[PDB]
């Protein structure tokens, strides 16, 4: 009785969701898409290599103009790159060298960073003094900072290692809402194209869909076996991809509320560090611990290429907003633009 | 190129100059990771989000990083050594300290990182076994018929009962360390106290031997 009684109600409700998910599975997405021509053999070559970081690169982000790019490393320095002329626009020294994430404002006036210091620091790129100064420090997260993504010049959302995600207001500096429900540490985050929702995978092998305005969880997806290290959102906004430590990518659908595809191979045994889609959503670029990235046919679950140019762990991965290039960072202190 | 893009590249080149002035200044320091429990006396071995303490011995700079499973332990993949502090006085929590040591030794990312083990509070261990009132045998059944201290060098003035207990606890942590690893990393066990000032020398000597046997290995001298 009591909690145990409530335990029977929780188990009964869990079976109802599973029964409803099984009812809608009239056909498999892989079975349905067995009528389209394959994407062929994707062959990408590293156009440029960005040098200057002196330790492992942990995060990277593309500007909305698809030309500027920010990266963070364990030196304690943020470098903004001109991805066309391999020029260093800025070099922002950080107070703490233990930084695991970095972001770029959609307007382009700000960058964010955070890590083991449990603080998201926001830097003003465009100041009258000609330098880069820190604008605000967002404190209130108990654990480390795993991800941070801007919604606009005043709103950012941070996922933390205290099993929570938070929405901040930079003008006030205070936490507006908090997103609770994850059991393990949240490791990734992905804002929807319409920005009204976002998704976050955690170490409890689950991914939750949140509503930013309401502030509570909408759907919960459980198909993985280990910690979900990376998450990314489909360009349409009705699906997302999860990359976990069990050497497998998965594709979940928001409307169907069910898993759609599994991206696995028997000769891959290492974890997945980063995932990203393409402009059309047909490709799925995912970095691994075996020092190279894989290109997956997102509709056919077949490999289509290998981005083998790094001699250490590929830690970050990003695709431009026009789909022209793929930037790949790794623990060998090198960033490579692929095309 | 144009006169504006030529001047932009001159600014970029100056950035790489500053990226190497401080980058070359951080290659002469050794970064250590401090691990342990709350009752271990973790932050009292060296008397000098994430905390950091700096100390220098024999003109060598040391950076000790104390935080506060461990998903952030992969950030310390390139540290010189791991410092694990154990409270050997109490035996109720000695079993969870051994399982504490097992996860770090058999970690996937720390397979090449050596561990300097400080069995802290050895003063209260002597009082707990001389005045008795407790029996490791209760918590560790092997100590009931534990081999007497294996013939070896003991510390002068220590009682035979104290040296029997000290050698038993130190043997548990080296049994885990020698079971696996295949010689890629070595555990260095020490016995400290709360009024011991020599723990800076011991870290210096252990890191000197840590670097020496991997310099000889990657140069294929041994």
């Amino acid at each position, epitope marked *: 009785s009591e909690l145990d009684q409530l335990r029977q109600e929780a188990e009964q409700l869990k079976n109802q969701i599973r029964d409803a998910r099984k009812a809608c599975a009239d056909a498999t997405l892989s079975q349905i898409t067995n009528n389209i021509d394959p994407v062929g053999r994707i062959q990408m070559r590293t156009r440029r290599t960005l040098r200057g970081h002196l330790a492992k690169i942990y995060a990277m982000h593309w500007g909305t103009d698809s030309r500027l790019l920010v990266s963070a490393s364990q030196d304690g320095k943020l470098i903004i790159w001109d991805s066309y002329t391999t020029n260093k626009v800025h070099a922002i020294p950080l107070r703490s060298s233990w930084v695991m994430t970095c972001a770029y404002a959609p307007s382009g006036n700000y960058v964010a960073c955070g890590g083991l210091d449990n603080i998201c620091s926001i830097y003003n790129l465009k100041t009258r003094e000609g330098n880069v100064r820190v604008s605000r420090e967002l404190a209130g997260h108990t654990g480390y900072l795993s991800c941070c993504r801007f919604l606009d010049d005043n709103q950012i959302v941070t996922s933390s290692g205290d099993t929570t995600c938070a929405l901040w207001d930079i003008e006030t500096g205070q936490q507006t809402t908090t997103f609770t429900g994850h059991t393990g540490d949240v490791m990734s985050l992905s804002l929807a194209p319409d920005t009204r929702l976002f998704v976050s995978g955690a170490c409890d092998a689950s991914a939750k869909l949140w509503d930013v305005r309401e502030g509570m969880c909408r759907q919960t997806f459980t198909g993985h076996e280990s910690d979900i290290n990376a998450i990314c959102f489909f360009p349409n906004g009705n699906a997302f991809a999860t990359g976990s430590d069990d050497a497998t990518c998965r594709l979940f659908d928001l409307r169907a509320d069910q898993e759609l595809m599994t991206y696995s191979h028997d000769n891959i045994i290492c974890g997945i560090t980063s995932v990203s889609f393409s402009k059309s959503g047909r490709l799925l670029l995912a970095g691994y611990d075996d020092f190279n990235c894989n290109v997956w046919d997102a509709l056919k679950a077949d490999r289509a290429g290998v981005l083998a140019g790094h001699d250490n762990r590929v830690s970050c991965l990003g695709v431009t907003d026009d789909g022209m290039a793929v930037a790949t960072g790794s623990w060998d202190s090198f960033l490579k633009i692929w095309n | 190129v144009s006169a504006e893009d030529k001047a*932009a590249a001159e600014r970029s080149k*100056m950035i790489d100059k500053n990226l190497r002035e401080d980058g070359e200044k951080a290659r002469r320091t050794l970064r250590l990771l401090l691990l342990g429990a709350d009752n271990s006396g973790k932050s009292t071995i060296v008397k000098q989000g994430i905390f950091e303490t700096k100390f220098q011995v024999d003109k060598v700079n040391f950076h000790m990083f104390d935080v506060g499973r461990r998903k952030w332990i992969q950030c310390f993949n390139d540290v010189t050594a791991i410092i694990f502090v154990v409270d050997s006085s109490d035996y109720n929590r000695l079993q969870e300290a051994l399982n504490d040591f097992k996860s770090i030794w058999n970690n996937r990312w720390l397979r090449t990182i050596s561990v300097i083990l400080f069995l802290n509070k050895q003063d209260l261990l002597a009082e707990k076994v001389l005045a008795g009132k407790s029996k490791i045998e209760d918590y560790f059944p092997e100590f009931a018929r534990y081999t007497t201290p294996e013939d070896a060098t003991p510390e002068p003035g220590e009682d035979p009962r104290v040296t029997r207990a000290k050698y038993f606890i130190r043997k548990e942590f080296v049994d885990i360390s020698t079971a696996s690893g295949d010689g890629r990393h070595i555990c260095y066990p020490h016995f400290t106290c709360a009024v011991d000032t020599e723990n800076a020398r011991r870290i210096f000597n252990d890191c000197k031997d840590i670097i020496l046997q991997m310099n000889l290995r990657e140069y294929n001298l041994v």
Partner: single-chain antibody
Amino acid sequence: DVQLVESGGGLVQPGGSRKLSCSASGFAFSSFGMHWVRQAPEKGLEWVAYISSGSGTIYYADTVKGRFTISRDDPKNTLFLQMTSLRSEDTAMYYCVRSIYYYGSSPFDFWGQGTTLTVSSDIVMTQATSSVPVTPGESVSISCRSSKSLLHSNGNTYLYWFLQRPGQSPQLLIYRMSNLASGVPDRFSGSGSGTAFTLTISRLEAEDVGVYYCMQHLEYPLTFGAGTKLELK
């Protein structure tokens, strides 16, 4: 906050030597390239010299090369212009202009006040209009012409617009022929193409009068336009 305080100047004899210094405060002086621009008493602006960040690159006008020298003192937050073998054609007012060069930066933001010196294969910029009467509240367009195509192979058209109010140092309003500077309202709009440019002002309010200078930044030396004065009715 930002200030470029000038020093020196005055009446000097011809054939002598004078040193001009411009003191900088309120910004990171070490990361800004600096320029010297003079204004004749009955003419427009004229670029003189240029020193980069770290003094790694120096450019001179062909009319001052060999007798003028530009240097900067980063720890002291000041720069100097050594002027030797003066003549009667150097009587002008010398401005110190800061300029920073990276992707998306706007050079020629802040112009200091001038020092009144009283000595007792180039792209030309052509502005046919020189004096135009403009009624308040109306809209006018001021054009400029070039002898060479300012559009580069990277897609950047290096044309700049400045406004010298009567009795004040000129200020940048449009840089690279399309981008509005910070603090300049949306009233000003710049547009053009290769060897053809214009500056459109809509709903001309007060304090919009003065002289408008077009400038090229495609190659050194940088040449200014003659100017287009605006007068009240």
